[PDB]
Amino acid sequence: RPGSTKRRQCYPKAIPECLRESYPKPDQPCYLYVIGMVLTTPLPDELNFRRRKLYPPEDTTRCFGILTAKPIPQIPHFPVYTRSGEVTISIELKKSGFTLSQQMLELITRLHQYIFSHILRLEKPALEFKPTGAESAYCVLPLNVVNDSGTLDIDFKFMEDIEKSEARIGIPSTKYSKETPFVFKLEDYQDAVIIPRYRNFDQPHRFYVADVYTDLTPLSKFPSPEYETFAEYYKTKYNLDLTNLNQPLLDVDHTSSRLNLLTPRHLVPELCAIHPIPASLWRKAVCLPSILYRLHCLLTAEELRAQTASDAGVGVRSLPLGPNPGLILQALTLSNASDGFNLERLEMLGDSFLKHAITTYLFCTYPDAHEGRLSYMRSKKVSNCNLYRLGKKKGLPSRMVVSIFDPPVNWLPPGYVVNQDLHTEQCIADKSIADCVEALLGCYLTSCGERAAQLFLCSLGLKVLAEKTLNHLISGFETFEKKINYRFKNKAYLLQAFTHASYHYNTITDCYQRLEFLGDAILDYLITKHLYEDPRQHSPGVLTDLRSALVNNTIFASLAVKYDYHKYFKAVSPELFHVIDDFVKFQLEKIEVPKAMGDIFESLAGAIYMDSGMSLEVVWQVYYPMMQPLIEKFSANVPRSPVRELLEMEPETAKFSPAERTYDGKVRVTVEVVGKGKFKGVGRSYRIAKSAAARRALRSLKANQ
RNA sequence: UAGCAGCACAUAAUGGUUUGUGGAUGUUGGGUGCAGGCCAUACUGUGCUGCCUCA
């Protein structure tokens, strides 16, 4: 069925408007952004297993810049988890409206290809570099501080030096001889990436110079137990005789193969070619996939924020407000993506508000429709099927973050195309599209409030925007008004809330059921909002349990009794009065729970809402003090099913019998606890019977301890 | 800077199981829809390893 977990559809991945077809043209205006990088949380030495120097990206003059034909909007700064620790990333506009020659652009584009294909090794047989044909079409280039002025500019000299370098295309063929002996220059290695010239020619291993040992030489002990010295090693393995046996040695670290950095984890110089790119900049380059991917994701969320400000009139289209793009990114992220956050908290809050909004709308739009009809209409509008259709219509599937980020397996680099797919497409369940709509609603609600959330629903396509008899029938309710600490402006709502369908003496208002319908959704929402805003920051699972335990007719009935609602209840059913008196007796001492007592509790919430001029706050002011003791009790001690508690205490020993229908229509259930006895429970339903059996077993077990 | 095979965990897919829930021919409750918790087949990622490339 549409909106079901069992139905899956494939969708193309969305690329932000500011990155789509964004390739700089010769002699045309372009934009240059600096990738600002700051080490905000250094990695502890215990996690840094080699205890290597942490390299704050900010300690070095060279960085990367993004060159694009279209402007990039302001995005929140975001963390990246490097081997140095948490690095906060900023994307900062450095130059706008400037032009580049064909030769300058060719140098930039060639170096851009060189980064992704040669440095990062992301170009695969399935991928082709087509910068003019690629959907995501921007260039990345080196920036450097000009003359120590602290001002960053395009390092053209360095790009040209990379082009003149033979080391660009492969391993340099410069073999040293006794006539042309190798000369070590320290300045050339302090911030160098090196390539060993005698091995692994198809995939040359690259290393960062971590340090230069001036005390160690080719005659010193080799790190592999296979050889006595560095000179013996090269002579034995590659037949290479060194010209300079007194040259210093390089301490080196492998260039990182891990390109996903979005979450926390917790040699002889003469025989090496110097890669023309410095090690500092190469460390920055390794972050480009996570940075660009995150940038792309945040730009998609900002695009959705801006689109919603245009379509719903919620927030401002361009920031100097609407929700933070990071919260939108949360609402667009499935738990499968493993990105440190998920849509589940926002989804649950949205659902509760959605119910409230539709319930209110239906109640006001259909003044003559009975509860069962409003409940039926409600059930259709809030369905996972309808929500899926709305999310699909809004283009959410192409914007959702569904799978774990893996650059060489599921990411397309800028300027590349796929040779005709984990790079361009994703498979999504219809239910997940529905869940995302509720999470977006929760985002707008938490960030911009209820009116904004309603305007957001309207933007998705959900339309969400006698007197003598009265005085006689309300006689004595003044004590009730004082007990609840609320005075009704229109006592007809109070009368309606306490009028059962059997109470035909009331010919001036309806029965309580319509207000029950309205109140149910109000209480669910208010309770859910409160639980979501709770300082304990309950998990999605715990929020579900607490919502289930607090939003319950039994609890509403228990409160109705404690607050004397039963004394004001108007009914003409002696049996109902006896059931209420028996339940009231049971509640006063500490057995069927009278449904009507929970219903009138909800109906009075509906009454107060209508009498207060649709003020949820007034309703909450009245109900929160009544519910606060229970909210505190269950949020301190998250509740349990007696069947589950018995199964937790006795998992292999407690076995329940099938449902036995007794001669009176009532169900009987027996629980056998191996070595501890058999306990029988009876009730009008299998759980009432099974729970009664489980409670009898639990009582016996606890009494024998 | 490489590949593979075990173990932990997360995770979606296709089956089953179990709690909640719905209007339904509802002769007095087994027809189907959606959620949770489990069992199985099979996917990916990180990590604890193990073998195994270069050093």
Side-chain angles (χ1 to χ4, degrees):
Chain A
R1 192 197 75 179
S4 185
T5 287
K6 296 301 190 181
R7 186 168 181 239
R8 278 189 145 231
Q9 296 179 78
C10 295
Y11 301 99
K13 296 182 191 167
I15 294 169
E17 177 58 52
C18 58
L19 301 180
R20 210 183 312 111
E21 300 174 3
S22 63
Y23 188 70
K25 291 182 181 179
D27 307 312
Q28 292 293 329
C30 64
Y31 305 81
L32 176 62
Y33 290 80
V34 166
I35 304 178
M37 300 177 75
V38 182
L39 181 68
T40 47
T41 312
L43 187 70
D45 282 343
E46 292 167 9
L47 308 184
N48 182 6
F49 71 98
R50 288 191 172 191
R51 293 188 176 221
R52 287 295 203 197
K53 177 176 174 179
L54 308 181
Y55 297 98
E58 60 266 48
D59 290 350
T60 57
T61 65
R62 283 191 174 104
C63 79
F64 285 107
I66 302 174
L67 185 79
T68 167
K70 291 181 177 177
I72 301 175
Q74 292 195 27
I75 53 152
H77 296 179
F78 58 84
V80 176
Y81 304 95
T82 73
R83 290 195 298 182
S84 300
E86 187 192 339
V87 178
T88 299
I89 306 298
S90 63
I91 302 298
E92 302 175 358
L93 178 64
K94 181 55 186 176
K95 293 182 176 180
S96 58
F98 77 111
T99 62
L100 290 170
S101 70
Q102 175 66 25
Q103 294 181 359
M104 284 179 172
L105 179 61
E106 281 176 1
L107 179 59
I108 288 162
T109 297
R110 282 175 294 162
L111 182 61
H112 169 70
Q113 187 183 8
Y114 192 77
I115 293 161
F116 285 88
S117 60
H118 293 67
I119 307 178
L120 301 178
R121 298 177 170 165
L122 287 167
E123 180 156 7
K124 285 294 186 178
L127 305 185
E128 187 182 16
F129 184 65
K130 278 179 162 155
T132 52
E135 297 184 337
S136 201
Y138 59 88
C139 290
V140 178
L141 59 77
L143 300 180
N144 195 10
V145 177
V146 180
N147 303 336
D148 307 323
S149 66
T151 71
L152 290 170
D153 206 355
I154 304 176
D155 198 351
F156 278 103
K157 182 181 176 183
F158 174 67
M159 304 197 277
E160 290 176 20
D161 291 341
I162 291 161
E163 176 140 272
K164 298 163 197 163
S165 175
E166 296 182 348
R168 185 189 184 185
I169 300 172
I171 302 180
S173 63
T174 42
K175 288 186 178 180
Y176 299 106
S177 82
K178 289 186 178 179
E179 303 72 22
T180 56
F182 170 67
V183 178
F184 183 81
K185 296 180 182 176
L186 184 62
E187 61 189 356
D188 292 342
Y189 296 89
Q190 284 175 350
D191 191 27
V193 177
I194 67 170
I195 296 168
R197 305 200 292 168
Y198 56 75
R199 60 164 170 155
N200 301 359
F201 296 90
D202 307 318
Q203 289 194 358
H205 297 184
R206 299 113 168 213
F207 306 83
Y208 305 116
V209 176
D211 210 346
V212 180
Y213 296 129
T214 53
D215 60 316
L216 301 180
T217 66
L219 298 176
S220 303
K221 188 177 179 178
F222 197 72
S224 181
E226 293 158 339
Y227 329 98
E228 193 179 359
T229 68
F230 280 84
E232 187 188 24
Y233 156 48
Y234 297 114
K235 187 173 187 124
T236 301
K237 284 295 193 184
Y238 322 100
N239 197 32
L240 296 174
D241 286 313
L242 295 171
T243 63
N244 187 348
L245 293 170
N246 294 336
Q247 68 191 283
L249 300 188
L250 306 177
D251 192 348
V252 307
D253 277 343
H254 283 274
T255 57
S256 184
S257 60
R258 188 175 98 123
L259 296 175
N260 180 351
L261 305 180
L262 300 169
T263 53
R265 292 193 66 246
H266 298 91
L267 299 182
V268 176
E270 178 174 355
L271 300 187
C272 300
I274 298 173
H275 187 268
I277 295 179
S280 53
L281 188 64
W282 188 305
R283 288 175 189 107
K284 298 182 182 187
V286 165
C287 303
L288 293 169
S290 289
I291 289 168
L292 295 178
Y293 180 77
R294 184 49 51 152
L295 169 63
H296 186 266
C297 296
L298 284 169
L299 289 170
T300 303
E302 173 51 20
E303 182 185 296
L304 181 59
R305 195 198 62 68
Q307 179 175 3
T308 306
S310 190
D311 296 349
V314 177
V316 296
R317 190 169 181 184
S318 55
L319 301 170
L321 294 169
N324 183 322
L327 293 175
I328 289 168
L329 182 56
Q330 178 177 359
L332 292 172
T333 300
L334 291 171
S335 52
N336 311 28
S338 310
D339 200 27
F341 56 71
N342 65 67
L343 70 79
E344 305 162 39
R345 281 190 44 112
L346 292 171
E347 179 195 356
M348 194 182 321
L349 178 66
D351 155 81
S352 71
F353 186 69
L354 175 65
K355 291 161 179 158
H356 164 60
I358 284 165
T359 298
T360 304
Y361 174 79
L362 290 177
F363 178 101
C364 300
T365 303
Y366 305 97
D368 301 321
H370 66 83
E371 173 278 312
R373 184 174 177 184
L374 298 173
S375 286
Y376 191 76
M377 291 176 77
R378 179 196 69 217
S379 81
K380 296 292 186 168
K381 301 299 180 189
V382 307
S383 66
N384 291 299
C385 181
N386 189 44
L387 294 175
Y388 146 69
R389 289 177 181 175
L390 301 172
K392 181 176 175 183
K393 185 178 179 176
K394 201 63 168 186
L396 302 185
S398 295
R399 296 181 168 82
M400 289 168 73
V401 181
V402 183
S403 61
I404 299 174
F405 174 58
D406 188 10
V409 177
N410 68 23
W411 184 63
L412 186 62
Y416 287 80
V417 297
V418 181
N419 289 329
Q420 300 190 19
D421 169 31
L422 296 174
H423 302 79
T424 57
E425 301 181 318
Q426 62 184 5
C427 187
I428 311 185
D430 291 7
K431 154 261 214 266
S432 302
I433 299 163
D435 301 345
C436 183
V437 171
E438 293 177 350
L440 285 169
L441 180 66
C443 178
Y444 272 95
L445 177 60
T446 308
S447 309
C448 305
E450 293 167 355
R451 176 60 178 186
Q454 289 168 349
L455 288 172
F456 169 60
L457 289 173
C458 293
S459 85
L460 294 175
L462 279 164
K463 297 186 186 176
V464 296
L465 293 172
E467 189 172 7
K468 292 180 192 153
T469 300
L470 180 62
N471 289 328
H472 178 67
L473 291 179
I474 68 91
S475 182
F477 278 69
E478 290 68 33
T479 307
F480 187 74
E481 286 186 302
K482 286 173 182 178
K483 183 66 177 192
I484 67 173
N485 197 37
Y486 181 67
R487 189 182 182 203
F488 279 76
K489 293 180 179 172
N490 186 346
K491 291 184 159 190
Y493 290 118
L494 179 59
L495 176 59
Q496 181 174 356
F498 282 95
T499 295
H500 187 230
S502 68
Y503 196 81
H504 57 273
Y505 300 115
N506 181 354
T507 58
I508 57 159
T509 75
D510 209 344
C511 69
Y512 71 67
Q513 298 180 333
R514 279 191 51 99
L515 296 176
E516 167 203 345
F517 168 81
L518 182 60
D520 181 9
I522 286 166
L523 290 176
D524 181 30
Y525 172 44
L526 285 174
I527 294 161
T528 300
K529 189 184 190 181
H530 184 73
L531 291 174
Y532 174 102
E533 292 178 359
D534 193 295
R536 292 167 281 214
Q537 294 187 353
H538 301 299
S539 69
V542 173
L543 285 167
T544 308
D545 296 351
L546 293 177
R547 183 162 80 161
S548 305
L550 289 165
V551 187
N552 185 291
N553 197 66
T554 304
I555 295 299
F556 300 160
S558 75
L559 287 171
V561 172
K562 182 173 177 182
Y563 289 93
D564 297 314
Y565 282 65
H566 63 283
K567 300 185 178 158
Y568 297 92
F569 184 56
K570 305 300 182 178
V572 189
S573 174
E575 295 179 353
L576 181 56
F577 285 121
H578 288 298
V579 178
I580 290 163
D581 192 49
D582 286 339
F583 179 68
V584 168
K585 179 185 176 187
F586 177 71
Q587 286 299 99
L588 290 172
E589 282 177 10
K590 283 194 172 187
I591 296 171
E592 175 174 33
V593 181
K595 187 192 175 284
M597 291 299 95
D599 302 341
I600 64 176
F601 185 86
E602 293 177 350
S603 84
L604 184 75
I608 290 166
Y609 181 71
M610 294 306 298
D611 189 65
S612 65
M614 303 178 179
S615 184
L616 285 181
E617 176 54 33
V618 173
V619 177
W620 194 237
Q621 285 170 8
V622 179
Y623 277 74
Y624 181 61
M626 301 194 287
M627 294 197 69
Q628 173 179 2
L630 290 176
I631 293 168
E632 287 174 4
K633 183 180 180 180
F634 293 167
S635 304
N637 291 327
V638 190
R640 315 187 195 184
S641 167
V643 175
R644 180 186 148 206
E645 181 181 0
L646 181 62
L647 292 169
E648 281 172 355
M649 289 251 291
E650 296 296 328
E652 297 188 347
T653 51
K655 295 185 180 184
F656 292 90
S657 77
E660 290 177 1
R661 301 310 290 229
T662 69
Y663 309 102
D664 312 326
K666 299 168 188 175
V667 189
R668 179 183 294 163
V669 179
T670 308
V671 66
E672 177 168 23
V673 189
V674 174
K676 284 148 166 187
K678 292 181 181 198
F679 308 93
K680 298 183 179 178
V682 182
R684 65 176 175 195
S685 80
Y686 180 73
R687 192 126 153 178
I688 295 166
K690 191 181 188 179
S691 176
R695 281 179 276 147
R696 281 175 176 159
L698 282 169
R699 277 186 276 174
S700 183
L701 293 174
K702 290 179 180 183
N704 289 329
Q705 277 179 352

